[PDB]
Amino acid sequence: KTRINYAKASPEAFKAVMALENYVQSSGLEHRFIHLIKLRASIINGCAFCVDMHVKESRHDGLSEQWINLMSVWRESPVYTEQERALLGWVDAVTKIAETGAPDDAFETLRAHFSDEEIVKITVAIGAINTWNRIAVGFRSQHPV
Amino acid sequence: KTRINYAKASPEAFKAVMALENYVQSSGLEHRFIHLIKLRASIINGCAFCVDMHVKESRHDGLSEQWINLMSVWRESPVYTEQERALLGWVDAVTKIAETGAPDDAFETLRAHFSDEEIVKITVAIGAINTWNRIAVGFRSQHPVEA
Amino acid sequence: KTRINYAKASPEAFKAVMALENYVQSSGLEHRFIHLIKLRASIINGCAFCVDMHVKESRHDGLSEQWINLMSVWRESPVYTEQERALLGWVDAVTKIAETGAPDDAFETLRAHFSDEEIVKITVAIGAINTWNRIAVGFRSQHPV
Amino acid sequence: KTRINYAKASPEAFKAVMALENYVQSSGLEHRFIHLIKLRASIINGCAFCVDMHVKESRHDGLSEQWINLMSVWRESPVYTEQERALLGWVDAVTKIAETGAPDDAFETLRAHFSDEEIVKITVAIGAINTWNRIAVGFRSQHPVEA
Amino acid sequence: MKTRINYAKASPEAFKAVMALENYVQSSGLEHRFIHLIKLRASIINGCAFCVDMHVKESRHDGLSEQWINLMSVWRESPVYTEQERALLGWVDAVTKIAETGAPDDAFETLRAHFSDEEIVKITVAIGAINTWNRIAVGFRSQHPV
Amino acid sequence: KTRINYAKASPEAFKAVMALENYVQSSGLEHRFIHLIKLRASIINGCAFCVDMHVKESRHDGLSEQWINLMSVWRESPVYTEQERALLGWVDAVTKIAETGAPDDAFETLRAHFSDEEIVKITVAIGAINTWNRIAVGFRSQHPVE
C-alpha cells in the first residue's frame, strides 16, 4: 500500500529530515511535551503511521492510557494540566496555521507557561512533526500491526 | 466544570435516551461494531466524556490497544478489516451528515459488507451516539480521571 | 429513489427511534419550540424529508408562513423573538457540535430564557431530530410531492 | 437595526445596482428560473432580507409552498425537475465560487438543459443576487414582519 | 479550448449590463487605489486568475508597488498596508465571504472609522461588482493573456 | 509587532531549521520548482514574511512577474506548464494534508512529471516551507518594506 520507499529513493533528503528530528529530541524540552506535540499533531493530520509510533513511545515513557487516548479530544478532557492545555492550544493553532493564523489568545496562554526559548523549540517541534506527517501520509507509509 | 446534571434536571428525558441506548445494546449487532460506532463518532464530535467511556468498554471487551488508539486516524491505518473500513466510512459520513450528505459510494461500500437490517441497526446506533455526544459536550460532562 | 425502507428492514430499530420521538412530543416543551427545533436542525442537516414534514406540521399548528420560510436564515430575520433566537443559537451550536463544541455564550444565552429542565428537554429534542435527519438522508427517504 | 440607508447615502450606487437588476428582469429568462436563482442564492448567503422578498415573489407567480420551503434543502427533495436541479447545482457552485471553483460536473449538467446564451443570463443573474445579498447583509437591511 | 463560453459573444446584452455596473464603479469617486485594492483582493479570494492578471496590471500601471501587489494574497500579516487599507481589506474579505462571516460588527465599525457612509456604499457596490466578474470569469473559464 | 526573534531566542533551533533549509536549497531540484513550492505554500499558509522573501528570490532568478503574481490563483491561470500544474496540485494537497489526505489523483499526476527521487525531494521541500511558515506566522515575523 506504500507509494514510495522514501528512505531508499532519496537517502540524503530523508537524513536531512532526521537531522531536524534528532535536534528536537535533544533540544532540552521535557519528553512529555515532545510526546504531546507529536501525538496531537499526528492526530490532527490523520497520520496513522505517526500516531501508532507516538502512542507506543508515550506508553514506553509511562504516560497513562487516558493521557494517550483522550489526546484526540483534549479540549473536553480533565486529564490535561493547565500547562499541557496551553501547549495543546498552540499545537492545534500552529498545525492548522492556514485556518487559524496563530491567534493572540493561544500565544498569550502559551507565554504564561513557557519562555521564548522553549516556545521556539516547541514550534520547531510542531514543524518537524508536520513534516513527518506530510511525508508519511503523502507516501502512504504503513505502520506495523 | 459541569453545566447541568441532566439526569437530575430531567429524569424522564434521561430515561428516554437510556431506552434508545438499551435498544442499541440489545439490537443484535456484534459488540465490536457497536464499540467502533460509539468510539469513532465520539472522536469526530470532540466528546471526551464519551471517548473515555468507550475506550474503557472497548478494552473490557478485548479490543487491542492499537484498534482503540488508531480510531482517530483510521483511514491510514492497516489495523482495520475491510468490513470495519466500510463501517467507518459510514460512521464518518453520517456523523458529518450536513457536510457529506451520505454519498452513494459510502453507502454502496457499506452494503457490500452488511445486510439492510444490519445497516438500519448501524445507522440508529450512529444516531444514538450522536445524541449522547451532543448531551455530554453540551452540558460539559466530566469523565473520571484515573489514579 | 429510496435506498432502504428502514421501517420494514428493522421494525424494532424504527420503533426505538419512534419511542424517543414520542417522549419529545409528551415532554412538556411548548410545541412552538419543538417545531422550531425540528425545522431548523433539519434545514442545517439538508434533510428534505424532515423539512417537508416539519413545515407542514408547523403550518398545521398555526405558525406563520414567514416564521417558517425564514428559518433557514434566522440570524438576519426580525421575525424571531429574543427567546426564539436564544433557542436557535443552541439548535445551531448543538447540531454542529463537532465544529462549535457548544460555546459558553450560546449556553448562557439559552440559560437566560429557559430553565435547566427545559434545556435538558431541548437538547434531547435536538438529539432526536439529528437522528431522524441521519436516517432520512442516510436512506434517501422521499417526501410526498 | 439597519446600519446604513444605502439608497439615501449613495443614490448613484443604488441606481447602478438597480440598472443591473432591470437587465436581469427583462433578460428573457423564464421568471421561475429567476425566482429560483434569487431565492436559493439568498438562502446560501444568509440574507433574510432577500429571502423574505423572494419567497413573496415566488408565491405571487404561483410557485408551490413546497417548491419555496424545500429550497434550503433541495438536493434531497423530489419536488424539483431535472432542469431545476441542474440550475440549482450551478447556483450553489457559483454562489460559493471561492470554495468550489465552479466544477466541470456542475457546468456539464447545466449545459445539458440550457443554451450558452441562457447560461450567460443565468450567471449574471447569480452575480446580481450575490451583490444584493452582500448589500443587504452588509448594511443589516430589515425585512417587514407580518402580523 | 480551455474556455467554456465566450460570454460577450454568447450574450452581448448581458455583457453590456455587467460592464455598465463596472463603468459606474470607475466613475464613482472612490480613490483608484481603493478600487484596485477591492478588485485585486476579492479576485484572489475567489480564485479568479483572469481578474487577478488584469488587476495586477492595472495596479502596476497606476504606480502601486510590487510589494503592495504581491502581498495582497497574505495582507493580514504584511506591514505594507496602511491602517485605512487594512480597514478596507477586512471589509473586502468579510463581504466577499458573506456566507461564512455574515459581515460582523467589528469589520463594519473598523471600516466606519476610515470611510464615510457614502464611501462605504460605493465600496460595497464595488465589492459586489468584482464578485460578479469573478463568478463570470471563473464560471466560464476565461483565459487571461500570457 | 514581532512576538519572538527566533534566531536570537534559540540560536540552536534556528541552526537546525537552517540545516534542513540548506539541504533543500542544494537538493538538485531545479530552482524554479523550489521557488514555486516555497511561494505557493507560503500563500496558502498566509505567511507574508515568506511570500515577500520568495517573491524577491523568484524575481532575482528571472521568473516573470506573471508567474509570481498568479501563484495565488494558479488553478485558473494558463501561465503554468503541465509539469508546474502537477507540482502545484501536490503542493496544495500536501500543504493541506489534514483536509485532503494526499489523494491518489494528485500523486499519480505528480508521478507523470517527476521521478520518485524528485518526488521525495519535493515533498521534503513542502515540509520545510510548511515549517518556516509556522515559525514566521506563529512569531509574527515582519518582512522589510521598500
Write the layout of secondary structure elements.
6 copies of one chain form a homohexamer.
Chain A: H1 6-9, H2 11-26, H3 31-44, H4 48-60, H5 65-69, H6 82-95, H7 97-100, H8 104-113, H9 116-138
Helix pairs in contact in A: 2-9, 3-4, 3-6, 3-9, 6-8, 6-9
Task: Describe what you observe in this structure.
Six copies of one chain form a homohexamer. The two termini of chain A are 14 Å apart. The first copy, chain A, has 145 residues and is mainly α. Chain A has one domain: AhpD-like (Up-down Bundle). The longest helix of chain A is centred in the C-terminal third of the chain and has 23 residues. Chains in contact: A-B, A-F, B-C, C-D, D-E, E-F. Chains D and E meet through helix 2 and helix 9 of D and helix 2 and helix 9 of E.
Q: What order do the SSEs of chain A take from the amino end to the carboxyl end, as H and E?
A: HHHHHHHHH
**Rg over CA atoms of chain A:** 15 Å
| CATH level-two architecture of chain A | Up-down Bundle
What's the number of domains of chain A? 1
Question: What distinguishing features does this structure have?
Answer:
homohexamer, structural genomics, unknown function, 9 helices, 71% helix, Agrobacterium tumefaciens, mainly alpha, AhpD-like
